[PDB]
């Protein structure tokens with residue numbers, strides 16, 4: 001019970017603050033779905049092109065799965081930073 | 093006309109690809125609105141607390157405007173990386 | 185009371201988990217002190233060298249205050265990522 | 277001998293500067309130990325929960341090992357940036 | 369034809385702008401070659417030292433391939449950010 | 461003399477290693493010049509458009525100076541990471 005009191009820097013949050021944090025989290029869920037959809041597109045693109053070496057080489061050179069992972073991490077850490085701006089912990 | 097042909101690594105894109113890129117951009121617009129709303133909350137919070145030194149010191153120590161800017165940059169660069177995964181330029 | 189239940193993805197945490205999170209936060213406090221000490225060194229270095237244009241130009245070109253801010257942000261976001269690995273939210 | 281003279285932008289450093297850089301490196305060693313401890317916790321958590329599919333799915337969805345790696349990289353690059361603020365190379 | 373008009377925020381670009389963007393891309397190609405050369409050095413270093421456990425352990429602890437990948441990503445995203453400063457999309 | 465021995469994790473470097481590190485630094489100097497050129501373009505663009513509010517608003521919304529600074533930092537930290545892959549310090 002009341003885990004936050006045990007965590008350093010955590011402070012009490014009002015309903016407005018919690019609602020804003022949850023708004024950020026919800027938008028992120030939409031990004032997650034978009035990322036899954038892009039991953040699904042990539043899976044199809046790769047499959048459609050196996051045996052067509054030129055396209056497989058082009059896709060390997062574009063590295064789209066690596067870039068999608070980069071984007072996912074930036075989206076998640078940006079969400080965390082916005083939420084920190086709302087929640088405002090009293091610690092480094 | 094056809095600026096992309098002049099830009100290195102840029103390739104022709106199908107309507108499905110362009111639609112996915114635009115989907116990413118649209119979700120980002122929603123993030124922009126959320127960020128503005130958080131900035132507006134912060135402006136109000138600061139204003140409501142001027143002359144209450146303890147709260148002004150607490151807010152200064154939490155640095156919420158800096159964290160909001162950090163989050164904005166991560167959201168934008170993540171969008172760029174997801175869009176690169178869709179668009180797949182043929183260059184470093 | 186029990187703010188975490190209202191925040192999406194947040195889950196109950198055991199004492200061991202909270203103790204590890206707090207360990208991360210404590211180490212960060214040590215980094216904060218080190219960063220302040222470096223900022224103090226920089227303030228002195230700059231002061232000692234005003235009127236010695238060559239050194240002031242060299243310091244301006246090294247941009248040490250900007251680099252210290254870069255380091256501070258990376259330390260804080262790394263702390264946040266380690267703490268997320270311990271706390272393990274059930275959301276994007 | 278005197279490798280630094282051969283490296284562009286590297287400049288001579290006083291004992292105080294070297295001591296501060298080493299202070300940063302030492303604090304980092306403490307972070308390394310903490311990261312290993314978290315990795316050990318994660319290994320145990322996973323092991324304790326194999327055959328309990330719901331928990332294994334939850335852990336896979338939280339991606340704590342990926343987040344721990346993210347945190348490690350941010351800690352290391354932040355250390356590098358703080359050390360650059362102390363050492364102040366005369367190059368881009 | 370004219371894919372840019374279909375992509376949100378994309379604007380018409382003059383020849384000077386496109387030439388600057390391509391200048392960035394070209395410099396990046398030079399970085400790609402340097403990165404390949406470093407990867408080749410690492411491959412040789414590892415090979416030359418197999419059976420010399422102490423050196424293999426030292427290399428594993430330095431993690432140079434991971435650091436090279438980190439550097440590659442930072443170079444590519446920095447290129448993207450400079451190009452965005454030139455191209456100036458009218459969107460988030 | 462021999463400052464590196466006093467810095468933790470620093471190891472002796474061969475001429476080939478130092479030459480590769482310097483190659484990275486040199487390429488970076490080329491990036492610095494390109495960044496200055498882009499900054500100069502931006503200064504001119506802004507100047508040419510003062511009193512044309514629509515263009516000044518568009519430029520303010522694109523935030524090209526902020527994006528150029530983002531790119532500069534990513535280029536510099538990527539250089540640092542590549543150089544760490546060559547130099548291979550024996551510390552966290």
Ligand SMILES: Nc1nc(=O)c2ncn([C@@H]3O[C@@H]4COP(=O)(O)O[C@H]5[C@@H](O)[C@H](n6cnc7c(N)ncnc76)O[C@@H]5COP(=O)(O)O[C@@H]3[C@@H]4O)c2[nH]1
Nearest residue numbers: 010011080083084087088089194195264267268271272273
């Ligand atoms: N002042 C204050 N009071 C709070 O109650 C509170 N709760 C969170 N925060 C801070 O918000 C910011 C963003 O949170 P996010 O959920 O994105 O990341 C969180 C989330 O991924 C995870 N986490 C924290 N608590 C829990 C929890 N109870 N369950 C699951 N995951 C958790 O660990 C990350 C980092 O936490 P901190 O980096 O220590 O504090 C956070 C951070 O500064 C708070 N700040």
Ligand SMILES: Nc1nc(=O)c2ncn([C@@H]3O[C@@H]4COP(=O)(O)O[C@H]5[C@@H](O)[C@H](n6cnc7c(N)ncnc76)O[C@@H]5COP(=O)(O)O[C@@H]3[C@@H]4O)c2[nH]1
Nearest residue numbers: 286287356359360363364365470471540543544547548549
């Ligand atoms: N002016 C100046 N004089 C110096 O003697 C000096 N030594 C280091 N630095 C700069 O400090 C900053 C942080 O150093 P860190 O050790 O975290 O990263 C270092 C470290 O990981 C690695 N490295 C450099 N020299 C060695 C070395 N001799 N042995 C092992 N690793 C080394 O390569 C990284 C990047 O070096 P640079 O990015 O070229 O210069 C560094 C950087 O700006 C110096 N700056």
Ligand SMILES: Nc1nc(=O)c2ncn([C@@H]3O[C@@H]4COP(=O)(O)O[C@H]5[C@@H](O)[C@H](n6cnc7c(N)ncnc76)O[C@@H]5COP(=O)(O)O[C@@H]3[C@@H]4O)c2[nH]1
Nearest residue numbers: 102103172175176179180181378379448451452455456457
């Ligand atoms: N205003 C404007 N008009 C343009 O014509 C234009 N073209 C690109 N940009 C923006 O430049 C910046 C850097 O571009 P880079 O090529 O590094 O990344 C690009 C590139 O990796 C990829 N991409 C975009 N279009 C194509 C394309 N036609 N073919 C291949 N890859 C493409 O997707 C990345 C992100 O694009 P955005 O993040 O939506 O817009 C870019 C970005 O802001 C433009 N901005």
